[PDB]
Amino acid sequence: GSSGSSGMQLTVKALQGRECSLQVPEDELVSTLKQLVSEKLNVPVRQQRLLFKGKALADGKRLSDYSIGPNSKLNLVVKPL
């Protein structure tokens, strides 16, 4: 497979922590957008949490619904499990 023309690039960065990029579409479900990274940093979705412009995403909705296009930098947060 090849990324670029189709889909978008998302770079998740944790507050003064770690980060990582991933290839996902524009209508990607927040539920999958998280599970994907969970494998990258080997962190459970239960802990790590994504944030956009101070907006809490719900596992299920689509980034497109939040008005988030390509080249979007998501914010990662650590929560106590």
Residue count of the chain? 81
CATH numbers and ranges of domains, the chain: 1-81 (3.10.20.90)
The answer to whether the beta carbons of residues 71 and 9 sit under 8 Å apart is yes
Structure tokens at 58: 């719900």
Structure tokens at 18: 């770690």
| Distance from C-alpha of 5 to C-alpha of 20, rounded to nearest angstrom | 20
| Distance from C-alpha of 61 to C-alpha of 8, rounded to nearest angstrom | 17
Describe the strand order of the beta sheet including 8-14 as a list of residue ranges.
19-24, 8-14, 75-77, 49-52, 55-56
Determine the 3-state secondary structure of 67 from DSSP.
coil
- Identify any residues that bridge with 26 across adjacent strands, giving them in sequence order: none
